[PDB]
Ligand SMILES: Cc1cccc(O)c1
Ligand SMILES: Cc1cccc(O)c1
Ligand SMILES: Cc1cccc(O)c1
Ligand SMILES: Cc1cccc(O)c1
Ligand SMILES: Cc1cccc(O)c1
Ligand SMILES: Cc1cccc(O)c1
Ligand SMILES: Cc1cccc(O)c1
Ligand SMILES: [Cl-]
């Protein structure tokens with residue numbers, strides 16, 4: 001999920017968009 | 022929506038809890 | 043400036059990119 | 064109070080020090 | 085840069101001012 | 106203080122409320 | 127409008143704190 | 157873990173900005 | 186509108202920065 | 215430490231919310 | 244104007260995220 | 273890495289407040 005993926009290394013806004021509804 | 026419900030007057034803790042999963 | 047352009051009305055993340063250097 | 068003094072006209076960081084312990 | 089200088093050890097307000105335009 | 110108490114293990118809202126006036 | 131945009135930014139941070147480990151659902155849809 | 161708590165606070169604000177009208181679910185688990 | 190709440194939210198973060206180790210007091214009076 | 219500085223910034227925003235009308239004192243010492 | 248001050252704070256955080264490694268310039272002038 | 277990323281978000285907010293009308297350039301490197 002978002003934590004395991006984005007708190008470990010920087011997520012771009014494109015990568016974050018994956019978590020949008 | 023939440024902006025309609027909580028942006029004109031402040032929402033209580035109970036009212037915000039409505040949006041928790 | 044960015045204040046006049048983005049505080050009077052909402053700026054999309056695409057419009058904010060104009061201020062990246 | 065700080066709200067009365069600082070929520071209409073911007074308080075300078077200098078002015079804000081009045082609220083430090 | 086400012087990251088190297090201020091994210092390892094705390095920078096005072098005066099030191100941050102070093103980075104203003 | 107609150108730093109020593111809440112900056113390693115997450116403090117609950119009740120634990121935070123102990124620092125209120 | 128901008129005011130609702132600024133308000134929403136704070137609402138999500140309040141929900142983050144209020145909800146804790148449960149997580150929350152944010153939809154600006156009227 | 158507090159570090160994760162802080163990371164999450166920032167993730168939540170980025171999602172708010174990136175997702176816009178679509179909104180989002182923040183499910184830590 | 187929730188302007189006073191928003192204002193206080195920012196005042197608190199500015200006091201935190203300005204006051205350093207001295208800390209501060211916030212009273213919505 | 216900077217981690218402590220960062221943690222504190224979030225703690226005061228949480229206190230601002232939890233304490234509401236009661237207000238709070240932030241005394242890092 | 245406090246409302247502009249508050250708007251500006253959010254603008255800076257939006258710029259930080261959108262611009263990333265590129266960095267940004269904030270000249271309210 | 274993420275720690276630097278989090279720190280940077282707080283740094284730009286501080287610069288916003290400290291620089292005021294002067295403005296600032298944020299260059300992560
Ligand atoms: C914007 C953002 C916040 C926190 C972690 C990330 O990887 C990205
Ligand atoms: C911005 C904000 C925070 C908390 C409650 C509200 O109604 C609004
Ligand atoms: C993201 C953002 C913040 C504040 C104002 C805007 O127009 C846009
Ligand atoms: C406008 C914009 C910038 C960067 C990423 C996005 O998903 C959208
Ligand atoms: C720094 C700051 C925030 C909010 C209101 C003010 O007057 C000053
Ligand atoms: C105010 C501030 C934020 C982040 C790092 C610093 O050294 C100082
Ligand atoms: C809400 C909050 C912020 C920072 C540390 C904590 O333990 C709790
Ligand atoms: Cl605001």
Ligand SMILES: [Cl-]
Pocket residue numbers: 162163220221278279
């Ligand atoms: Cl942080």
Ligand code: NA
Pocket residue numbers: 105
């Ligand atoms: Na100059």
Ligand SMILES: [Zn+2]
Pocket residue numbers: 162165166220223224278282
């Ligand atoms: Zn942070």
Ligand SMILES: [Zn+2]
Pocket residue numbers: 132135136191194195249253
């Ligand atoms: Zn705000």
